[PDB]
């Protein structure tokens, strides 16, 4: 679990959203597993507006942070599950590392801020569905 709250915004892995999510709901893609609801609270969460490929990311299933270089933000064939068919994913992001299913929402950050959240796994590998795109999560 895990979500980014960057002003009047809450973003979660679509396949995790709540009803509170979806009945507050701004946008979705489930080609890139995001969905974006709106909160009564402000959030102060600095989203990167860069091309990084190195940064630290959260692994709730180690309690630690984990340093990783990842690859720029592709469409990623991702295998069936009881949330999607088998499918490729756009904007998504590979890493050498490990993760397992509780771990998606954990944040990945450069040094300019939050790049995205945990979303895929397996195989010693863990993607992340990039948030760096989405420019309108500022203004
Ligand atoms: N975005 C999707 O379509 C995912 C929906 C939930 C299931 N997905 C996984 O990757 C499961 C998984 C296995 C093993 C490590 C692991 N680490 C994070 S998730 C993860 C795919
Ligand atoms: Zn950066």
Same mark, same amino acid.
């Given at each position: $679990? ?14 995790? %959203?709540?009803?509170?999510? +979806?009945?507050?709901?701004? +946008? ?14 402000? @959030? ?10 190195? @940064?630290?990311?959260?692994?709730? &299933?180690?309690? #630690? !942070? ?5 690859? #720029?933000? $592709? ?10 068919? %088998?499918?490729?994913?756009? !904007? ?19 040094? !300019?801020?939050?790049? @995205?959240?945990? &979303?895929?796994? @397996? ?12 420019? +309108?999560?500022?203004?």
């Amino acid at each position: $679990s895990g979500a980014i709250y960057v002003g009047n915004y809450r973003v979660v892995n679509r396949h995790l %959203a709540t009803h509170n999510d +979806w009945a507050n709901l701004v +946008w979705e893609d489930s080609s890139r597993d995001l969905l974006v609801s709106s909160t009564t609270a402000q @959030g102060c969460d600095t989203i990167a507006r860069c091309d990084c490929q190195t @940064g630290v990311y959260y692994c709730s &299933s180690r309690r #630690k !942070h984990y340093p990783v270089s990842f690859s #720029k933000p $592709s469409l990623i064939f991702v295998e069936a599950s009881e949330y999607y068919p %088998a499918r490729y994913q756009s !904007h998504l992001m590979l890493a050498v590392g490990h993760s397992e299913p509780g771990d998606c929402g954990g944040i990945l950050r450069c040094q !300019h801020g939050v790049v @995205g959240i945990v &979303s895929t796994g @397996g195989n010693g590998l863990v993607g992340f569905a990039d948030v760096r795109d989405l420019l +309108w999560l500022d203004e």
